[PDB]
Homo-oligomer: A and B are copies of this chain.
Amino acid sequence: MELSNELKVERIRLSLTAKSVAEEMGISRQQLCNIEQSETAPVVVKYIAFLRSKGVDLNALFDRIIVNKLEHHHHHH
Contacts and interface: CB of A to CB of B under 8 A. Distances in A.
Interface of A: 1, 3, 6-7, 10-11, 14, 16, 21, 24-25, 27, 31-32, 34-36, 38, 41-52, 54, 56, 61-62, 64-66
Contacts of A11: 51
A44 B45 contact: yes
A31 B10 contact: no
Contacts of A16: 54
A38 B38 CA distance: 18
Copies in the complex: 2
A42 B43 CA distance: 10
B10 A51 contact: yes
